[PDB]
Amino acid sequence: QVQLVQSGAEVKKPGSSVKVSCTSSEVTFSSFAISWVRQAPGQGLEWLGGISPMFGTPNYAQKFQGRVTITADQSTRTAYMDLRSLRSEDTAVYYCARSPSYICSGGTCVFDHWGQGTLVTVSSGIQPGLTQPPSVSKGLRQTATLTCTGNSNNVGNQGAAWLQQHQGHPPKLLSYRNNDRPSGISERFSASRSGNTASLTITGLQPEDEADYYCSTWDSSLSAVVFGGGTKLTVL
Amino acid sequence: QVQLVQSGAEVKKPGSSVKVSCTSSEVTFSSFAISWVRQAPGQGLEWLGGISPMFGTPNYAQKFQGRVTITADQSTRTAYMDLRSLRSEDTAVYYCARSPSYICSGGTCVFDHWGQGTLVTVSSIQPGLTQPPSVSKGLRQTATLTCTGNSNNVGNQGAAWLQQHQGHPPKLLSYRNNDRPSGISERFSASRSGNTASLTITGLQPEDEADYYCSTWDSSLSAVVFGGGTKLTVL
Amino acid sequence: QVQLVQSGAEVKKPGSSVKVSCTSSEVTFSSFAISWVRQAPGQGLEWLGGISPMFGTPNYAQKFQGRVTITADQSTRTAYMDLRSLRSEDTAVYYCARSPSYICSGGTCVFDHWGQGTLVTVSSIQPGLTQPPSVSKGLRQTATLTCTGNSNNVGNQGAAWLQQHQGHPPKLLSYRNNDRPSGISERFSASRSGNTASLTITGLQPEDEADYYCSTWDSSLSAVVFGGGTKLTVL
Amino acid sequence: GLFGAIAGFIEGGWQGMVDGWYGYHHSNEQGSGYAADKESTQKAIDGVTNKVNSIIDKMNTQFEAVGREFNNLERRIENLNKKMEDGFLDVWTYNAELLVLMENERTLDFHDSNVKNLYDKVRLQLRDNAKELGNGCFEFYHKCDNECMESVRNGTYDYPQYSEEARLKREEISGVRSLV
Amino acid sequence: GLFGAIAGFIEGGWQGMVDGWYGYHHSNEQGSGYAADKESTQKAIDGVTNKVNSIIDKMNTQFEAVGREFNNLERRIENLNKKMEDGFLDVWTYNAELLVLMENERTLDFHDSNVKNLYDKVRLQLRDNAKELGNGCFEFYHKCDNECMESVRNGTYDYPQYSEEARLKREEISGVRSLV
Amino acid sequence: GLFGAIAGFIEGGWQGMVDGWYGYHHSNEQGSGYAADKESTQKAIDGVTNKVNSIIDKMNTQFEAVGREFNNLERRIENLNKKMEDGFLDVWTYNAELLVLMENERTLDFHDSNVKNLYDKVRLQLRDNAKELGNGCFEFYHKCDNECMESVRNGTYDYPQYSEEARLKREEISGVRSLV
Amino acid sequence: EDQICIGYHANNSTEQVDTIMEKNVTVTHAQDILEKKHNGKLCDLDGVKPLILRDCSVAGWLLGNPMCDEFINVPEWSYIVEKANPVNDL
Amino acid sequence: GAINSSMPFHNIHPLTIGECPKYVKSNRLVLATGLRNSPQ
Amino acid sequence: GAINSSMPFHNIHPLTIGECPKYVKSNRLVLATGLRNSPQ
Ligand SMILES: *[C@@H]1O[C@H](CO)[C@@H](O[C@@H]2O[C@H](CO)[C@@H](O)[C@H](O)[C@H]2NC(C)=O)[C@H](O)[C@H]1NC(C)=O
């Protein structure tokens, strides 16, 4: 286990700035690239951008290009996100993700660990890149198949990694880019990709399995991480 | 310091088959090739075969192609001989023997350490090098023992000598380059001349009379060969 | 720190040779070339020859090409100067000095560490570089002392400067490329421009008024070379 | 040092290659530019990251000293206690220093081959098709555009596709035409 | 590894070479097959052997452990006795544990050399009488039969015997002749 | 050794070279003779010297030693005292013995690159102006006098200067002229 | 015809060293790091004489043994040198 | 006896006093500095 | 003082209690992760 701990639940007014933080337990943190992903109330994931702590070079999404500047402080194991001229539709929870990739700049960059979540509310004064269907419902103890379709600037080429998200917690990683599952994950969850569509099949459906699932990779054309719509799996 | 310990002296009916085992003292077991080398009663020495314990691959003599099967367990640091179809010819004492080289397939395969002996008997001979059968020279004189061969053995690969007293297993007097092990005294110097290898023993003493065998790799048979033997007699 | 240590003051009869030695504290002693440099009553420095302990190849100045023999011993930590065919022009104090280079064969032969000196007396100089003999500047003023030379010596290597108060043996103030050693105070700019080099002293005081020698390797003369001297006088 | 590259024939590293540890720089009709080799930096990081956690793991059993109280006339076992703990704290302080000193040498040399093995990789692909210019860099015979650089970059260049092109250039800067 | 022979340009080892650690494979008009460099596997074995014997012989100056007895009111010098004996078994466990770890790294890189330094040996013998195919494998201009092979194998190849034969092939791939 | 120079392609050392640890021999119409590469013999010595000074500097904070004395009926705390010192002197002996044995292996395989990498510098400068002969040694296509040897030796040879001299020769020992 | 080799140094050197892989490797150049010699005398520790109690024990000296008279009032000492089994104890 | 030396180690006797080299239990302890001396 | 750390070593005080780094008599302990640096 490595810890990622995030800034408190800041509350700002139109046009101002934020500086949210996130702090890594591991002494060896210099070598795992850190990202900043957000999700606003009742929606899905959006990649703002990420940094390699080792080298200082960050990558951002067009979306935020000139108006978000993320930097890591090697010295104190701390990655900073701050965005400018913040308005209303930036009301979100700002999660904080590590990748086993040293830089975040290609299909290698998949998110193994997440911070607890920094909530930001703008106190007054979204369009996804991958295709998942929104709901799939399957009876107890059966087999579910969840799909993620994309084109060729993404899934076709980079591969595609899956994520689980329970109402209220951050999302655990289910599969790596390359089909392999990480430690905690039961053999019940089998990832696979065929061509331009990626499918995660789960056997023996149990009440726990019921959550929202996201797929993701890199898009060559957008130079950015891309999540799918999310798909809420129910069971009874 | 090494110790090769062979097994009990099984005795059997014809057709039957034996599984003798040499078990090595030492931790670097795999790195040294083990050979098996029977001696029928009264006669000299004959190689059956031998293995690289580390690689597994074994080498047999034309004569035993189909019959013997030798291998060695690395985990237990012990080597094995499965000899089959044995008639009365096959009765002998059976030595295992350590090579200083890793595999047994060439002139460097000489036999520096030997086990204690395993007499197999069976209920109801042909040397590959030339060695005078007897040499008799007087006490404190000096001696010259000769082994001759040809181009496929002593010619190219060179030869290695062996002393054997009645009862005991043999021991190494010299390596293929005629450098002497630590053990052996300095009046046992060996050298070689084309196809005729010779060990000169100087200052003969009571001690010295026993057998002497030369041995080499013969690259025309893929096999280890020995001379007939030669009894030295101090006089 | 390292310390060299020399032999007792010898007195000698014309013709009769001398051997004088010095010995080193430091264990890494075969890594540093050792030299011998005499100073006859009054005048200035002169390099006889030098040795690489590690290799034991020496090289000498031609003035002594066949008269002197200098060598170092590895086991004990010591070097020797054997000045045969002694005579009257030879009376001096003889310093052994360590060069940080492992060999004494070029510019890198500067002298960072000197022995305390051995006076050798017999019973009954031309400088290769050019310095004025007397610079005299006032308290808290700046002096610039100049060594001038040519392409064989100063103009390719550059120079090392040295300080010498009456009594004490010489201390090094710059390496051949204008870096100062540890001890040297941070107000002694060395420099070099073409075929002339200048030790610039800033903020004079009584301490500073001693003799100053430049030095380098002459690639034509196959040897080490010193200027005449410059007595600094503060006032 | 050992392997020949870093601070060797490739005199000096580049400040322009910001994204990674080793990499490429090219020059052609379309552009000039740097490009880090991630593959093999990522493999080097794997190995350093493993080294760092290697030590951490190796010193969790390291000697812990909880103290003991001692009397006025027990002075000489009070000492024995003090000699021991000072003893162990010297032995482990030595260890922890020497291991670092040793791993640092190994690590700097690990990069040193990393670089060189990259170069020799490029070299074994581009053969006769390019000149070994002798300072870390190759000029091609056949003129090689961006898409073709990639192949060298990602180690799937194709010798027998630019052969003629290149060996028409070898054929001529060998002055062999000049007899007609 | 550091030398980039194993898992490198030589793209995996050959299963079919059963009789030794390093070696040759070849094809000619005659035949085809594998042949272990017994010679240089033996220099390997002899060094990896000295290594395990080097260890053993160092590890009988290991801290010899005998036991002592203490009553109920010497409790705290019973502890001192334990803080010592644990203390040491940590110092020596760390030492065995790391020394194995460090001579594992060295061994694998030692092999990775032995191979590179075998490739290069052949390369210097055949020079421009063969092509560096650049995957570990050379290919001859002049035809090279089974006797010729042994020469390269056992390291007594001779260039000058085959130059003319070779620089007819070299001469003509370069289509110089192609000006008739 | 590891790097394959000393006791490798460069078969044995030259006794004729006394001035230093590594160098060049040459031959040309005027010259023939040895000459050590002091500047890199010098760099090597700076290393090996630092190595000795590093080990002395690690061995001043060993486990220290001063003396203690015991009653006849304290015999078993005497023992504990003894097992202790004899524990610590078992441990600093191993550390000394093993450090030397290891740093000895590395020092010998350090010299083996110093020499390889010197050979590779000469190589990269001279390209196809000279024929790599393979026994540690290059022979030139263009004649190259004593003043040009230094240039190779001090590492500022000038390829373009002798290019057409050299490639006139290459061009003719290719017998491509033999076609008229 | 003109040519230049690279090479390394070789000499009349007998001294050999060991390594984890090679024992008795002969090299051109060595460096012992092991002191083996002493002068067989008790000496000063930096111009400060020891206290050689000779055939007294410490107890023999402090209590005031009439054999231990030449110690009745002693100068400062570097270290003390008791014998194996001093004849003059209690 | 009094020990003389600059060497890092000695092997005379364990119980020293003063600023000394450091006791080890070995008979011989030589660093290599030069090249393999396999000539010709 | 207490220590809040993930480093494997410290140099505050030998007689710690709790789940610690491991005391070392040193005052500087820095691994290399990157390559030798330079200007070009
Ligand atoms: C390595 O060389 C040493 C050199 O001393 C050999 O040491 C021998 O040691 C024994 C004591 O047991 C002496 O009787 C011999 O005289 C020594 N031999 C010689 C020729 O000096 C040692 O045997 C050699 N071999 C190994 C592997 O240690």
Side-chain angles (χ1 to χ4, degrees):
Chain A
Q1 61 187 352
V2 291
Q3 320 315 332
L4 281 155
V5 325
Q6 315 197 226
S7 172
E10 294 185 52
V11 192
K12 299 308 218 86
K13 296 183 175 164
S16 71
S17 275
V18 241
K19 252 258 166 101
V20 186
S21 75
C22 183
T23 299
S24 216
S25 133
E26 66 193 358
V27 77
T28 197
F29 119 118
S30 332
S31 62
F32 300 88
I34 278 180
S35 275
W36 284 96
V37 174
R38 89 186 171 188
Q39 91 159 105
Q43 307 228 76
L45 290 317
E46 193 168 301
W47 180 70
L48 265 94
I51 183 88
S52 181
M54 173 97 87
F55 281 109
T57 325
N59 307 60
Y60 309 96
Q62 309 240 151
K63 218 185 289 267
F64 309 87
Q65 187 57 40
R67 171 250 188 177
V68 156
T69 51
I70 114 279
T71 53
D73 173 279
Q74 289 232 61
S75 184
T76 74
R77 282 142 36 207
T78 324
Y80 298 132
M81 201 264 295
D82 93 59
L83 64 165
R84 250 67 31 63
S85 178
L86 73 92
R87 313 159 300 98
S88 191
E89 226 293 295
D90 304 55
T91 301
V93 170
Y94 285 92
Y95 287 91
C96 184
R98 169 162 101 54
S99 284
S101 183
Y102 88 84
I103 200 132
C104 197
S105 61
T108 60
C109 198
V110 347
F111 312 103
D112 50 18
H113 307 114
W114 300 62
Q116 78 266 6
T118 291
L119 184 55
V120 183
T121 325
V122 202
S123 56
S124 202
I126 85 174
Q127 183 44 234
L130 262 20
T131 301
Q132 322 182 241
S135 317
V136 194
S137 317
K138 288 275 166 175
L140 272 165
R141 295 147 45 209
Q142 304 264 330
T143 279
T145 279
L146 298 89
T147 69
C148 172
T149 291
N151 55 55
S152 205
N153 302 290
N154 45 66
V155 186
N157 198 58
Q158 317 303 334
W162 284 98
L163 292 171
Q164 186 202 76
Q165 164 139 94
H166 280 108
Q167 159 64 4
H169 315 114
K172 339 299 191 196
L173 181 91
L174 305 202
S175 100
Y176 289 110
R177 174 209 209 188
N178 64 269
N179 286 347
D180 288 11
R181 71 172 72 85
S183 294
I185 311 305
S186 56
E187 35 100 39
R188 208 205 340 296
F189 295 77
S190 164
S192 216
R193 164 179 143 267
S194 208
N196 270 23
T197 280
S199 295
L200 157 61
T201 48
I202 337 175
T203 36
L205 286 165
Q206 198 179 353
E208 284 57 49
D209 299 1
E210 167 159 351
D212 279 283
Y213 291 75
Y214 294 90
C215 67
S216 84
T217 353
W218 192 254
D219 196 288
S220 318
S221 77
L222 301 162
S223 293
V225 146
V226 291
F227 310 95
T231 139
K232 200 265 293 265
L233 166 55
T234 62
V235 211
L236 260 81
Chain B
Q1 219 301 312
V2 301
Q3 283 187 4
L4 298 158
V5 277
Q6 308 154 27
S7 234
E10 287 175 293
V11 155
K12 305 196 90 184
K13 196 161 140 69
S16 279
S17 40
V18 260
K19 188 161 203 188
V20 188
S21 66
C22 209
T23 316
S24 194
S25 153
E26 54 175 4
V27 197
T28 25
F29 160 64
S30 307
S31 17
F32 299 62
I34 274 178
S35 288
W36 281 97
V37 167
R38 78 180 174 188
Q39 176 161 60
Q43 292 104 68
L45 305 166
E46 187 186 349
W47 188 66
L48 284 122
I51 186 166
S52 180
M54 166 146 297
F55 279 100
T57 163
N59 278 37
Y60 307 100
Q62 281 207 136
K63 191 178 181 190
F64 304 87
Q65 207 46 43
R67 312 208 296 95
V68 195
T69 275
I70 103 76
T71 44
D73 176 289
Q74 306 198 58
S75 274
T76 68
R77 308 189 319 269
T78 126
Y80 297 73
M81 195 209 76
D82 179 277
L83 178 52
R84 301 197 210 99
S85 325
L86 57 104
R87 326 99 214 187
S88 197
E89 162 155 299
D90 297 19
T91 306
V93 271
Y94 281 56
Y95 300 98
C96 92
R98 214 269 272 262
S99 174
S101 65
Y102 87 81
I103 188 147
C104 203
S105 64
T108 60
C109 203
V110 299
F111 310 96
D112 60 9
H113 299 107
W114 302 63
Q116 90 290 13
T118 299
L119 185 43
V120 163
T121 323
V122 191
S123 303
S124 33
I125 55 179
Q126 171 55 338
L129 288 177
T130 295
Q131 262 192 309
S134 311
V135 169
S136 327
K137 293 206 170 189
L139 195 43
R140 198 165 48 263
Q141 285 282 19
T142 67
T144 310
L145 271 70
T146 57
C147 172
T148 297
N150 65 52
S151 168
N152 314 285
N153 37 61
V154 195
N156 305 155
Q157 286 83 333
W161 284 87
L162 280 166
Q163 184 186 240
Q164 174 156 66
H165 287 92
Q166 210 248 358
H168 297 96
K171 80 168 158 181
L172 201 74
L173 306 178
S174 72
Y175 295 108
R176 175 182 92 148
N177 46 296
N178 339 116
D179 291 33
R180 73 166 56 74
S182 40
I184 326 308
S185 88
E186 72 262 40
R187 22 178 269 289
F188 285 67
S189 79
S191 77
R192 184 185 133 273
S193 332
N195 308 249
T196 302
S198 302
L199 165 64
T200 275
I201 306 150
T202 47
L204 290 158
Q205 291 295 297
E207 300 94 55
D208 312 341
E209 55 174 61
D211 293 347
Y212 291 103
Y213 301 84
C214 68
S215 79
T216 298
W217 189 259
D218 179 18
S219 42
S220 91
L221 296 169
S222 316
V224 177
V225 293
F226 301 93
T230 169
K231 308 223 117 155
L232 186 29
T233 322
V234 172
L235 222 66
Chain C
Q1 93 283 240
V2 188
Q3 310 155 48
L4 289 26
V5 144
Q6 268 152 287
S7 301
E10 293 219 85
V11 170
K12 281 285 167 179
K13 294 222 176 304
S16 92
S17 63
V18 66
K19 170 136 102 168
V20 61
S21 88
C22 102
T23 313
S24 174
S25 104
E26 65 182 343
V27 182
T28 54
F29 139 95
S30 317
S31 56
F32 307 130
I34 266 75
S35 300
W36 290 99
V37 170
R38 84 186 172 197
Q39 193 171 31
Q43 307 111 60
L45 307 186
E46 176 184 17
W47 168 85
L48 286 144
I51 190 70
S52 154
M54 172 88 46
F55 289 98
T57 339
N59 44 55
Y60 307 99
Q62 260 165 279
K63 183 179 177 183
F64 310 85
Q65 194 63 67
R67 184 159 44 106
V68 321
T69 292
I70 117 71
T71 56
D73 167 287
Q74 302 248 39
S75 78
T76 67
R77 38 188 63 276
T78 321
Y80 303 110
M81 186 207 78
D82 191 302
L83 217 191
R84 283 184 312 290
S85 174
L86 265 153
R87 41 209 183 72
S88 198
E89 197 195 55
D90 281 323
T91 298
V93 268
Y94 288 79
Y95 304 101
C96 73
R98 170 161 88 63
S99 186
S101 202
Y102 83 99
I103 196 105
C104 198
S105 299
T108 32
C109 212
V110 320
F111 301 91
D112 57 7
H113 284 58
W114 300 72
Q116 82 295 358
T118 289
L119 201 175
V120 165
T121 326
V122 187
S123 54
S124 293
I125 176 159
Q126 191 207 45
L129 304 179
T130 284
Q131 343 176 244
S134 280
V135 178
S136 314
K137 294 264 180 158
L139 259 186
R140 314 158 103 267
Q141 298 302 299
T142 277
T144 75
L145 295 72
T146 79
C147 187
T148 333
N150 70 26
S151 193
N152 315 344
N153 36 54
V154 188
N156 303 154
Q157 280 66 220
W161 281 91
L162 297 180
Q163 196 198 58
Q164 179 157 81
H165 292 91
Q166 164 258 111
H168 318 312
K171 176 189 73 165
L172 186 92
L173 308 178
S174 85
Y175 297 102
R176 117 181 187 283
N177 71 315
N178 307 323
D179 311 37
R180 63 184 124 248
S182 166
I184 302 320
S185 98
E186 320 74 35
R187 56 154 164 94
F188 281 74
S189 154
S191 219
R192 178 185 162 282
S193 211
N195 290 100
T196 180
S198 296
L199 188 246
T200 330
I201 303 179
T202 15
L204 289 173
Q205 65 172 161
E207 287 78 342
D208 303 330
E209 120 180 305
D211 293 296
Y212 291 75
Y213 298 73
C214 66
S215 89
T216 205
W217 184 267
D218 191 311
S219 14
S220 139
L221 288 173
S222 195
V224 150
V225 127
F226 303 98
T230 330
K231 255 123 173 312
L232 183 59
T233 273
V234 177
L235 73 195
Chain D
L2 272 205
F3 266 90
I6 307 171
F9 64 96
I10 310 183
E11 187 223 326
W14 311 323
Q15 306 261 309
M17 193 184 66
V18 328
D19 26 45
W21 265 342
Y22 336 105
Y24 300 98
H25 170 89
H26 62 77
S27 175
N28 66 345
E29 286 267 316
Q30 323 190 54
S32 101
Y34 292 110
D37 176 304
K38 302 196 175 164
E39 206 87 313
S40 52
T41 292
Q42 176 70 229
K43 196 177 300 91
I45 285 176
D46 275 45
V48 190
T49 286
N50 291 334
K51 179 172 283 192
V52 165
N53 275 134
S54 236
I55 297 185
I56 299 215
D57 291 16
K58 250 51 254 167
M59 309 196 178
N60 286 111
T61 353
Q62 205 236 76
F63 171 70
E64 312 184 351
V66 315
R68 243 139 300 128
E69 215 78 20
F70 265 111
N71 178 313
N72 151 231
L73 291 151
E74 297 186 313
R75 211 58 83 186
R76 84 208 142 97
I77 67 186
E78 180 171 329
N79 195 62
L80 199 175
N81 195 74
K82 195 64 143 288
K83 274 271 175 200
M84 163 183 142
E85 285 173 6
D86 276 338
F88 278 109
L89 292 175
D90 270 277
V91 165
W92 282 108
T93 302
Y94 165 90
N95 274 200
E97 269 157 348
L98 170 157
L99 168 48
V100 169
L101 257 66
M102 292 224 285
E103 278 333 296
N104 276 15
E105 192 143 53
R106 294 200 62 74
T107 299
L108 287 205
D109 276 353
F110 165 65
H111 293 319
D112 202 14
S113 348
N114 272 6
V115 165
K116 184 217 174 158
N117 298 293
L118 225 103
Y119 172 92
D120 282 302
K121 190 210 79 175
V122 169
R123 187 175 70 82
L124 291 234
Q125 280 177 283
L126 304 193
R127 297 166 265 158
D128 4 50
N129 281 359
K131 262 179 183 139
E132 202 172 326
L133 223 51
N135 60 7
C137 201
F138 308 87
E139 71 177 69
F140 300 78
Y141 293 125
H142 77 283
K143 65 154 164 130
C144 165
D145 80 10
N146 289 163
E147 185 166 309
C148 153
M149 296 285 319
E150 258 282 63
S151 76
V152 180
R153 225 101 111 274
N154 70 245
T156 71
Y157 177 95
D158 200 300
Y159 175 76
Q161 180 168 340
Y162 317 94
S163 192
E164 339 77 323
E165 192 145 295
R167 61 76 43 188
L168 245 29
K169 225 298 298 204
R170 296 190 252 119
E171 200 207 64
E172 74 96 297
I173 77 149
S174 63
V176 162
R177 293 225 210 81
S178 319
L179 317 75
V180 259
Chain E
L2 282 170
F3 288 98
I6 304 175
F9 60 89
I10 315 206
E11 272 281 71
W14 322 315
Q15 294 278 328
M17 184 174 85
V18 319
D19 35 24
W21 276 331
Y22 329 122
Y24 311 91
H25 171 100
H26 65 80
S27 277
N28 54 356
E29 300 315 274
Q30 308 224 48
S32 179
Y34 296 102
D37 197 334
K38 353 75 154 297
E39 200 92 329
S40 110
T41 301
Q42 178 76 239
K43 204 180 274 88
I45 283 161
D46 292 6
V48 166
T49 284
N50 291 328
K51 198 179 262 164
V52 321
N53 282 120
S54 280
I55 289 163
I56 297 151
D57 295 317
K58 271 183 191 165
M59 305 293 199
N60 41 20
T61 318
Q62 243 204 54
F63 173 52
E64 320 275 309
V66 315
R68 250 150 292 111
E69 205 73 287
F70 302 94
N71 83 31
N72 142 276
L73 290 142
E74 304 162 17
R75 202 69 64 163
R76 92 218 131 112
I77 88 153
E78 164 182 347
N79 178 80
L80 184 150
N81 178 51
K82 192 68 148 291
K83 289 270 197 183
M84 156 169 138
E85 284 168 356
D86 295 357
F88 272 106
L89 288 189
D90 282 319
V91 170
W92 284 112
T93 267
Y94 163 98
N95 266 306
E97 213 150 13
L98 175 127
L99 167 47
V100 168
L101 235 73
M102 277 197 293
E103 290 314 306
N104 277 6
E105 191 136 89
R106 296 195 67 77
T107 305
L108 298 190
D109 278 342
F110 169 57
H111 285 300
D112 201 41
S113 205
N114 291 324
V115 167
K116 216 310 171 214
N117 295 273
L118 212 105
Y119 175 81
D120 277 326
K121 164 175 180 195
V122 167
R123 179 177 75 78
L124 301 191
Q125 280 187 280
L126 337 170
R127 297 177 223 153
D128 61 28
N129 283 350
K131 271 176 189 138
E132 221 167 353
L133 241 35
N135 72 334
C137 198
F138 302 81
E139 137 169 11
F140 293 105
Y141 297 116
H142 75 278
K143 293 206 226 159
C144 177
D145 85 21
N146 290 154
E147 196 157 285
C148 169
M149 294 288 321
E150 256 287 20
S151 91
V152 170
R153 213 128 82 258
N154 82 233
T156 68
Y157 174 88
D158 81 321
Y159 193 80
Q161 197 167 322
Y162 308 92
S163 66
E164 8 62 11
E165 201 169 320
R167 47 74 53 188
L168 257 55
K169 228 297 295 202
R170 278 177 278 154
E171 194 193 269
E172 83 77 56
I173 70 79
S174 296
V176 169
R177 199 189 301 254
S178 318
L179 291 148
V180 170
Chain F
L2 269 171
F3 273 72
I6 310 179
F9 51 89
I10 320 206
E11 312 176 67
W14 319 308
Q15 313 273 331
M17 186 167 64
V18 329
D19 341 278
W21 274 332
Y22 333 104
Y24 314 79
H25 165 99
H26 70 19
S27 202
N28 61 347
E29 250 292 43
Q30 33 182 356
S32 155
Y34 302 103
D37 183 16
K38 293 176 200 217
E39 190 183 52
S40 81
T41 269
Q42 174 55 276
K43 189 172 273 185
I45 291 195
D46 283 16
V48 167
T49 289
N50 290 322
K51 185 180 282 201
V52 262
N53 285 124
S54 294
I55 308 186
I56 301 188
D57 287 20
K58 274 17 262 167
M59 311 301 215
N60 306 103
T61 43
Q62 269 195 33
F63 165 52
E64 301 272 314
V66 310
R68 240 168 307 113
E69 198 102 35
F70 282 107
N71 178 357
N72 149 237
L73 284 152
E74 293 187 311
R75 207 69 92 179
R76 92 217 131 114
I77 108 187
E78 200 166 302
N79 197 77
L80 178 156
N81 188 77
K82 192 105 140 270
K83 284 287 175 189
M84 153 142 195
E85 298 138 10
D86 286 21
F88 276 113
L89 286 162
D90 271 337
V91 170
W92 286 107
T93 271
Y94 164 97
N95 287 162
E97 271 159 336
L98 164 139
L99 175 40
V100 133
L101 240 23
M102 271 178 44
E103 234 33 63
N104 267 9
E105 176 159 335
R106 292 188 62 88
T107 307
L108 279 194
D109 291 318
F110 172 61
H111 288 299
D112 202 60
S113 335
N114 286 16
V115 156
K116 213 287 149 275
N117 293 308
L118 219 111
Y119 179 88
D120 272 314
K121 161 137 85 277
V122 163
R123 180 162 73 76
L124 283 204
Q125 297 163 254
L126 320 178
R127 318 213 227 83
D128 50 341
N129 276 348
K131 188 185 286 139
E132 197 189 342
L133 236 38
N135 65 16
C137 211
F138 305 82
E139 77 150 33
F140 277 113
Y141 287 133
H142 76 274
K143 32 187 180 167
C144 162
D145 78 347
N146 289 163
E147 129 102 305
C148 160
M149 299 294 311
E150 255 294 298
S151 103
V152 179
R153 248 142 49 205
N154 73 253
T156 52
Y157 166 92
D158 189 18
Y159 192 83
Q161 192 167 298
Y162 317 87
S163 69
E164 1 64 319
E165 193 147 87
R167 52 76 50 187
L168 251 59
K169 222 295 302 195
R170 273 179 281 146
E171 190 205 69
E172 68 98 290
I173 70 151
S174 304
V176 319
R177 184 175 298 140
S178 302
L179 320 168
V180 215
Chain G
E1 196 139 42
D2 288 5
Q3 102 192 181
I4 185 166
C5 296
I6 312 298
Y8 58 96
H9 168 79
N11 61 24
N12 298 345
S13 188
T14 222
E15 56 215 349
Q16 58 194 32
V17 296
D18 300 349
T19 83
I20 292 281
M21 292 212 167
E22 254 155 289
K23 226 204 144 178
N24 298 344
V25 159
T26 310
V27 297
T28 68
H29 290 92
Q31 181 64 43
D32 199 346
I33 68 190
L34 188 46
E35 193 48 58
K36 291 191 229 169
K37 301 184 157 149
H38 52 97
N39 55 8
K41 288 146 220 147
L42 277 178
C43 303
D44 284 10
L45 203 28
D46 284 311
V48 187
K49 190 193 187 276
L51 177 61
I52 301 183
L53 296 182
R54 300 174 88 195
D55 304 61
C56 292
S57 59
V58 171
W61 162 55
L62 303 155
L63 289 185
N65 191 297
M67 313 258 183
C68 299
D69 276 353
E70 52 101 334
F71 302 103
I72 53 180
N73 267 307
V74 313
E76 59 141 349
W77 63 90
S78 179
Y79 57 106
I80 310 178
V81 173
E82 218 182 342
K83 215 90 97 173
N85 327 134
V87 296
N88 314 123
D89 201 45
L90 308 174
Chain H
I3 298 172
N4 205 355
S5 148
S6 333
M7 308 282 193
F9 307 101
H10 76 66
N11 70 192
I12 287 173
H13 180 96
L15 303 111
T16 283
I17 33 178
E19 210 168 49
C20 295
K22 304 310 190 94
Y23 190 71
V24 304
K25 82 198 289 222
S26 332
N27 284 304
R28 188 277 232 289
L29 221 65
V30 206
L31 286 167
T33 62
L35 329 163
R36 242 162 259 208
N37 192 177
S38 238
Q40 193 202 347
Chain I
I3 312 166
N4 140 244
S5 56
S6 49
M7 301 289 194
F9 298 80
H10 68 96
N11 73 359
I12 297 162
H13 193 93
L15 309 210
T16 303
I17 68 87
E19 191 90 343
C20 299
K22 310 270 200 181
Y23 190 71
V24 277
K25 203 176 277 206
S26 59
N27 65 180
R28 176 166 137 90
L29 222 57
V30 184
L31 287 154
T33 52
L35 356 166
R36 198 144 24 205
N37 199 42
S38 80
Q40 210 212 241

